[PDB]
């Protein structure tokens, strides 16, 4: 994350909320804690970001035959 913050988030590049929505999903799906903290910290509106389709996508990322995955399958 230090490389990304030092290079991409040095302030020279003008970012946008939609420019980070895809990356935010990737960090959440790939278990990147420092990145989601960094991405949200850079003025990202979480309330408008989260959608029921996105939430369903997040729960669909249960790792293989995990215990949680079994509960959704039963549910």
């Amino acid at each position: 994350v230090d490389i990304a913050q030092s290079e991409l988030f040095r302030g020279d590049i003008q970012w946008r909320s939609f420019h980070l929505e895809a990356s935010l999903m990737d960090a959440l799906l790939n278990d990147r804690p420092e990145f989601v903290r960094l991405l949200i910290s850079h003025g990202l509106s979480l309330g408008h970001f989260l959608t029921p389709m996105r939430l369903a996508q997040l729960y669909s990322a249960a790792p293989s035959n995990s215990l949680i995955r079994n509960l959704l399958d039963q549910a």
Binding site: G11, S41, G43, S45
Partner: protein
């Protein structure tokens, strides 16, 4: 108990007509029968003020908000005497005048945290004053929610100056005999971009009347005049007290604010600018970072910043560059607050700014800054 208020204060009306629509925003049909280039003072009529009183916001609130409408051409001395004596407001140990536009309904989370944690706690600790725009928009709203969040987590005297005309529900404030009971429809359903509601977190309201139906920048003259008079005032008890430091906090802004800071610096008032605020405020911070940069390769850097740190309109114009040059002519007064990845601590910055602004060997001039150093724990 407010008999002198209509007498020692005045209100401004449009009077003449200077075009269907004139410059005052009040159209031809609704106009006095007394009806080139409009003049705020030559084309206005002075009448006794008829909007003073104590506002009581509907619902949650302190049931006390002293709001007064006063003409622009008024001495700040009378206003300060009214606030300190009649309204019972204690003489402030510090006055912070938050300035800026802060374009956008929302601001950065770190910026909001610095406002709520840094400014409000520092104001609360020393019993300071926070003078902002008395409107529920821009920086005025942001400081309003910061005060409200701190208050409910525990007061802080934060008042607002707003032009007369841009205030919604101005019909319920009119009572020449006094508006001590007053109900405000701050939650009015209709929304418009020329009239904004008053925040419910401000202890006092100063409605600047200049004979217009509503615009921006009509309170700048009174705002600077009030700040300078307080800076040249003692903390009560007559002359036995010490001076009251006055500091200006700047976040973002536009061309109108750039004149404000230049005028304030001309008025010998310490200024404080925060890095990363946005356009028209980081330009000064970057120019401070260059400091005594050489003219060769740096003279055009001003115009480069004019186009990248500010909007394209007036960027090619060198009038703003002249304003920049005038500002650095007294660069000792103003200082920059480094974000430091969200320091949320600027009492040291304020103390450093105030101590460097005085520049007097006499210990009397440094008494006020000493008390603030005592009031805070640094």
């Amino acid at each position: 108990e407010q008999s002198w208020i209509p007498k020692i204060f005045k209100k401004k009306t449009c009077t003449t007509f200077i075009v269907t629509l004139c410059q005052c925003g009040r159209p031809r049909t609704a106009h006095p029968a007394v009806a080139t280039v409009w003049d705020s003072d030559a084309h206005t009529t002075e009448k006794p003020t008829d909007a003073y009183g104590e506002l009581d916001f509907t619902g949650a609130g302190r049931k006390h908000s002293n709001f007064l409408r006063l003409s622009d051409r008024t001495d700040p001395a009378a206003v300060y005497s009214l606030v300190t004596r009649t309204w019972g407001f204690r003489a402030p140990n510090l006055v912070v005048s938050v300035l800026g536009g802060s374009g956008g309904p929302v601001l950065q989370t770190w910026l909001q945290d610095l406002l709520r944690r840094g400014l409000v706690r520092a104001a609360q600790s020393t019993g300071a004053w926070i003078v902002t725009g008395g409107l529920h928009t821009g920086i005025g709203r942001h400081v309003g929610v910061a005060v409200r969040d701190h208050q409910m987590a525990s007061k802080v005297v934060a008042m607002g100056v707003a032009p007369w005309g841009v205030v919604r529900n101005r019909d319920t404030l009119i009572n020449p005999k006094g508006s001590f009971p007053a109900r405000y429809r701050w939650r009015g359903d209709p929304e418009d971009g020329v009239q904004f509601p008053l925040d419910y977190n401000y202890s006092a309201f100063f409605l600047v009347d200049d004979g217009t139906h509503g615009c921006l920048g009509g309170e700048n003259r009174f705002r600077l005049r009030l700040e300078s008079y307080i800076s040249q005032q003692k903390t009560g008890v007559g002359g036995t007290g010490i001076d009251i430091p006055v500091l200006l906090l700047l976040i973002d802004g536009d061309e109108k604010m750039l004149t404000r800071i230049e005028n304030a610096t001309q008025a010998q008032l310490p200024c404080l600018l925060v890095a990363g605020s946005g356009g028209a405020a980081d330009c000064l911070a970057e120019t401070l970072e260059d400091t005594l940069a050489p003219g060769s390769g740096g003279a055009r850097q001003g115009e480069a910043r004019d186009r990248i740190r500010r909007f394209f309109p007036k960027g090619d114009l060198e009038v703003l560059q002249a304003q920049v040059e005038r500002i650095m002519t007294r660069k000792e007064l103003l200082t920059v607050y480094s974000s430091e990845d969200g320091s949320e601590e600027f009492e040291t910055i304020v103390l450093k700014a105030l101590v460097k602004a005085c520049g007097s060997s006499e210990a009397s001039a440094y008494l006020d800054e000493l008390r603030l150093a005592v009031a805070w724990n640094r």
